[PDB]
Amino acid sequence: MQIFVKTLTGKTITLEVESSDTIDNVKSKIQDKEGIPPDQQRLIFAGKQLEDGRTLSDYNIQKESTLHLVLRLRG
C-alpha cells in the first residue's frame, strides 16, 4: 500500500508499505528517504503518536492515509 508522511516544513513523503509493517519498520523507510534515525522520529496519526513494537494495522491505518512526522531528540 501507499501512505503519505507530512513533515513540519511543507514536504510530503510517499512510502510503499504493507499493513503488517511495524512502526519501527515504517521509521526505517523514512530513514532511508529522509536520513532521520528512527530514534529521532515521532509518527502521529489520528491524534496519537505511534509506538514501536506495534504495526500499522494495530492503529487501523489504511491505504492513502497521511501520517505526520515530527523530529525528536531521542526515543
Partner: protein
C-alpha cells in the same frame, strides 16, 4: 413539511443560530446509500443513528467557505437539530478528537502534547498541556456558535469547518447549489427531483459568504 415550510425553517435558522451544509461528491451515493436507508428505518420501526456524516456550519454573516475543491458539488442544507458528534475549525461517536494535535503543537511547541491520546484526554490534562482553545473541538451546538462568533462579527472569511452529525430525513431542508458551476447545478437538479419523488420537496439554496438565497430551478 412542504417546500415553503422547509425554506422558512431553513432561513429562520440561518438568520438566527445557523445550521449545517453538507457538500457531497456523489449525490446518487448520498441519496441511495445514506438518505434512503435513513428513511427506510424512519418509516419502518423508527429512525436510528447508524449513519454519521461530515458537514460545515453555516450562519448569516459568517463568511465561511464550503469544501468543494473542484467547484462541482451539490449538497444538503441540514437543520440545526441534527444530532451533533463533534465540531472543529480544522464514524461512530467516540472518534472525534478533543483537540487538533498537529495544530496545537505548531502553536505551543510543547512536546508533552505527544504523550497523550487526543481522543482520551481530560479537560485538566488539556489545560495542563496549555492547549489553546483555538485547537480544541466542541461538542454542543451552542459552543459551535461561540467558536465562530468572532469571525462572524468581524466579517472575516474562514476556511471550511468540520462537524460530524447524524441527520434524519426531517432534518434535510434544502439542496445546495454552486451558482458558478454548471456541474453543481446539474447534480443538484437530479438530487432535488429524486428527493421530491420520495415526498421531500426541497428548495434550491445558493449559499455563499454568509448569505443564502432561494432558487427557482437550476
Amino acid at each position: 413539511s412542504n417546500r415553503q415550510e422547509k425554506l422558512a425553517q431553513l432561513m429562520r435558522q440561518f438568520e438566527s443560530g445557523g445550521l449545517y451544509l453538507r457538500t457531497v461528491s456523489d449525490h446518487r451515493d448520498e441519496f441511495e446509500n445514506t438518505f434512503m436507508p435513513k428513511l427506510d428505518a424512519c418509516l419502518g420501526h423508527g429512525c436510528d443513528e447508524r449513519y454519521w456524516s461530515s458537514a460545515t456550519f453555516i450562519q448569516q454573516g459568517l463568511n465561511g467557505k464550503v469544501h468543494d475543491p473542484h467547484a462541482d458539488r451539490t449538497g444538503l442544507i441540514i437543520s440545526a437539530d441534527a444530532r451533533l458528534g463533534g465540531f472543529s475549525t480544522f464514524y461512530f461517536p467516540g472518534q472525534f478528537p478533543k483537540f487538533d494535535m498537529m495544530g496545537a503543537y505548531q502553536a505551543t511547541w510543547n512536546e508533552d502534547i505527544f504523550s497523550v491520546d487526543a481522543t482520551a484526554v481530560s479537560e485538566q490534562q488539556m489545560d495542563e498541556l496549555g492547549i489553546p482553545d483555538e485547537y480544541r473541538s466542541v461538542f454542543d451546538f451552542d459552543r459551535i456558535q461561540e467558536k465562530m462568533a468572532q469571525p462572524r462579527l468581524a466579517g472575516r472569511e474562514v476556511e471550511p469547518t468540520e462537524a460530524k452529525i447524524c441527520y434524519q430525513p426531517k432534518d434535510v431542508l434544502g439542496i445546495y447549489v454552486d451558482v458558478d458551476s454548471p456541474a453543481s447545478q446539474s447534480k443538484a437538479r437530479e438530487l432535488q427531483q429524486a428527493m421530491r419523488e420520495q415526498g421531500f420537496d426541497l428548495p434550491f439554496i445558493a449559499y455563499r459568504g454568509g448569505a443564502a438565497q432561494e432558487l427557482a430551478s437550476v
